[PDB]
C-alpha cells in the first residue's frame, strides 16, 4: 500500500493514472475507487492504493481518496 | 469475465473465497465488491470477477453480483 496523486482522470471514460513520486504511473479504473458516491477522481487528488497485476499489466486496487 | 460462486464470505471480517471451476478458490476482499450496495457477499452468490495478482498472490477484482 502506498500514496500517490491523480495525474489525470477522464471522467467520461472512467479511467486515468496515478502518479507516484519516484515511480511509474499506475493505471486506475473507476471500479477500484473506494467509498460512496459517484466513482471519479480529479487531477491532483491524493490517494492511497495497492498495485495488482491483471491481464493488461499493473493497475491500481483499493483506491481511497485522502 | 471469470465466473465463480461465493464459497463463503464473512461480513464482519470483510473477506471470503470464490469457488471457480477447475481452479483454486480465489480470495475476495470487500473492497473488490461492486455496487452502491453494502459491500457484502453471501454463500452461493454467483459472481463475475477478474483474477489479479497482488502481493499475497491471486485475488478477486471487480466482483459483480449476478
Ligand atoms: Na513518477
Ligand atoms: Na475449484
Curated annotation (Swiss-Prot), chains A, B:
The keyword ATP-binding does not apply. This is Cold shock protein CspB. InterPro entries: Cold_shock_CspA (IPR012156), Cold_shock_domain (IPR050181), CSD (IPR011129), CSD_CS (IPR019844), CSP_DNA-bd (IPR002059), NA-bd_OB-fold (IPR012340). It is found in: Cytoplasm. Keywords: Activator, Cytoplasm, DNA-binding, Stress response, Transcription, Transcription regulation. Residues 4-63 form the CSD domain. GO terms for cellular component: cytoplasm. PROSITE patterns: CSD_1 (PS00352), CSD_2 (PS51857). It comes from the Bacteria. Induction: In response to low temperature. GO terms for molecular function: DNA binding. Affects cell viability at low temperatures. Homodimer. Its main location: cytoplasm. The keyword DNA-binding applies. Pfam families: CSD.
